[PDB]
């Protein structure tokens, strides 16, 4: 109707809330890139995407990578990989390309050189989304000499631009 | 007809208020630690995000002093909030009830000036009373230390509307 604006829409012939606003399910297959102090590697993942109200949830599954620095970055490339009709712009946060410290969590990464892993408690937060790439900061907890990193399943959520 | 917030006029139509969907603020204030005989204060600059009926307090990493095995962290919102956000805007939907909401694992690095050793503490929102939000920090054991390295922590809870 010319008198209702999304998310307010016609629900079974009545003024209600659009179910697409309440729940939307999508998927992402793309590159997760790690950048540390002199360290760079790439991993391909298949993550579930849930859009609920004005939040977006990127449910990353467990992945295995290589050496990480005490301070580094995790980058998700949303320029490609999103299942249609979800577009790259749908992953833009409500704070757009601002630098933030949002959703800071503790993540346990297992560092190993092929032997028994040792788990370090790193600090992860959403820092910036720019040109379709969501950048997560991973720092703290110290390190050991390692060649491989075991990353846990991590859910990255933030407000979605409307 | 008559509209009640968050339902408001959106470009001449019944829609959802953008202020309800996303609101950004700031807090510069004192974070106080109270443990078993231990008390110290830190000044922080925190980003505040209000999305739908949630409030997100994005605390950055701060450094403090000795902590007990069980203790509390208090955020004083009576002063420090960037206008027009007021202290009452930080009150949760459960008001001053004692709860155990948003329980997360936080890794704090304890040290005596040397390399820190990271303890996995348990943090949750416990109570908001008279503009002070109290977070509980307990569990994980302890060591002899004089300084505590706190990670960036995001504290979220439902926001009161009535």
């Amino acid at each position, epitope marked *: 109707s010319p008198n209702l604006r999304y998310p307010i829409a016609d629900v079974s012939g009545g003024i209600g809330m659009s179910p697409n606003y309440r729940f939307r399910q999508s998927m992402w297959i793309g590159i997760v890139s790690y950048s540390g102090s002199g360290l760079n590697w790439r991993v391909q993942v298949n993550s579930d995407i849930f859009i609920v109200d004005d939040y977006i949830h990127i449910c990353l599954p467990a992945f295995d990578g290589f050496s990480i620095a005490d301070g580094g970055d995790l980058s998700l490339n949303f320029v490609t990989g999103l299942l249609p009709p979800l577009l790259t712009g749908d992953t833009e946060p409500a704070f757009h390309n601002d*630098v933030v410290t949002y959703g800071a969590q503790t993540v346990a990464i297992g560092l190993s050189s092929g032997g028994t892993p040792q788990y370090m408690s790193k600090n992860l937060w959403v820092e910036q989304w720019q040109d379709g790439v969501l950048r997560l900061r991973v720092e703290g907890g110290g390190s050991i000499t390692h060649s491989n990193s075991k990353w846990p399943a991590m859910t990255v959520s933030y407000p979605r631009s409307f | 007809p008559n509209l009640r917030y968050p339902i408001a006029d959106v470009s001449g139509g019944i829609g959802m208020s953008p202020n309800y969907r996303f609101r950004q603020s700031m807090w510069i204030g004192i974070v106080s630690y109270s443990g078993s005989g231990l008390n110290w204060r830190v000044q922080v600059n925190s980003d505040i995000f209000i999305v739908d009926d949630y409030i997100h307090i994005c605390l*950055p990493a701060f450094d403090g002093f000795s902590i007990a095995d069980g203790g509390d962290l208090s955020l004083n919102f009576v002063t420090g909030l960037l206008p027009p956000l007021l202290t009452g805007d930080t009150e949760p939907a459960f008001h001053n009830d004692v709860v155990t909401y948003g329980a997360q694992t936080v890794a704090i690095g304890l040290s005596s000036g040397g390399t820190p050793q990271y303890m996995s503490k348990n943090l949750w929102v416990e109570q908001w009373q008279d503009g002070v939000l109290r977070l509980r920090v307990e569990g994980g054991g302890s060591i002899t230390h004089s300084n505590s390295k706190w990670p960036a922590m995001t504290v979220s809870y439902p926001r009161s509307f009535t």
Partner: antibody
Amino acid sequence: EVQLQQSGPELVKPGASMKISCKASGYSFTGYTMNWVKQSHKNLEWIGLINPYNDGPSYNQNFKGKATLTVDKSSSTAYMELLSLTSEDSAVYYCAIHYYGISYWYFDVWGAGTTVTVSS
Amino acid sequence: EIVLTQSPTTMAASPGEKIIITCSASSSISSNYLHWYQQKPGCSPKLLIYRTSKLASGVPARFSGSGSGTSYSLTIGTMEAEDVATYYCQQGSSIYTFGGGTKLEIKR
């Protein structure tokens, strides 16, 4: 607006000691941290920090023993004493505080600077 | 520990040009801890950009900041004669460190 008023230029012979003051005005809260910056010749070096709740001064390892930070909380003025002044210590000394930039550690308000000349 | 290295050390530009000053960190630092300062001749250092891309109160809109990891850059859209100054990048992730400066001059 918060302002910082520093001492005037000081003239000191080598081997002696000078004491510089920095007074804060117009602040809304007391939790700002006082810093000191050295700009020689024009490279900037951070000397130390004073925090009202830490109960102690943090120093740069290079300036350990060359400077000692103090604060008179009753007068809201910060002090920095330089010991055994040499020719390389002749520079402009700024005081800056962490006021709006307390958690990301950017100096958002600076002092006028106190130029120090050391000569025999 | 962390050293910030700026390029160029000096540069001369005519007004209207786009000016790019870079800051390279020896260690990957969070973008929340990289800040820029502007020091006009004979003046004190003034805060220009904080938290990488946030403009300080009162700075012109032509100033912009960008970067992540170990590479950060300060960009002037169209330079003005007022912009002639020395710019420093500073890091707050570890012990505080400044950049060493980049002097901006007029084209003659």
